[PDB]
């Protein structure tokens, strides 16, 4: 009589699954320094330097934790990263009235330091 059938779904934000992995590693910290209070601890054994092996060669032991977040950004998912980061907390956050573009600002702060994506460099892979 009759036969036929067909199934398959599925959503994304960002490219194959950087939002995933940026979540976590890329820009995921940076525009939280100043979202936050200030830096601190958190996970990651690469934390025994006061100068930062990898990171600007001055004490910044903060920004460091941005250096080191953005050094586990893949090379695509680095600009996607900032549009998440720098947005995520401006959801989250009280980022709202006319206080939403200080951020925009303020995460180019830590981008000069080690957060060059997509707030101030463009798409690179």
């Given at each position: 009589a009759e036969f036929m059938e067909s199934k398959g779904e599925?959503?994304?934000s960002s490219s194959q699954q950087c939002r995933q992995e940026?979540?976590?590693?890329?820009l995921s910290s940076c525009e939280r320094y100043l979202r936050q209070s200030?830096?601190?601890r958190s996970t990651g054994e690469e934390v025994?330097?006061?100068?930062?092996?990898?990171?600007?060669?001055?004490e910044s032991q903060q920004?460091?934790?941005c250096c080191n977040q953005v050094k586990q950004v893949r090379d695509e998912?680095?600009?996607?990263?900032?549009?998440?980061?720098?947005?995520d907390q401006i959801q989250q956050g009280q980022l709202h009235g006319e206080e939403s573009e200080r951020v925009a600002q303020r995460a180019g702060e830590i981008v000069s330091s080690?957060?060059?994506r997509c707030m101030r460099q463009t798409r690179t892979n």
């Amino acid at each position: 009589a009759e036969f036929m059938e067909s199934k398959g779904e599925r959503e994304g934000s960002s490219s194959q699954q950087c939002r995933q992995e940026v979540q976590r590693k890329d820009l995921s910290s940076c525009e939280r320094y100043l979202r936050q209070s200030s830096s601190r601890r958190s996970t990651g054994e690469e934390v025994l330097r006061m100068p930062g092996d990898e990171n600007q060669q001055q004490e910044s032991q903060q920004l460091q934790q941005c250096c080191n977040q953005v050094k586990q950004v893949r090379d695509e998912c680095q600009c996607e990263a900032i549009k998440y980061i720098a947005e995520d907390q401006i959801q989250q956050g009280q980022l709202h009235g006319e206080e939403s573009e200080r951020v925009a600002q303020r995460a180019g702060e830590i981008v000069s330091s080690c957060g060059v994506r997509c707030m101030r460099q463009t798409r690179t892979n």
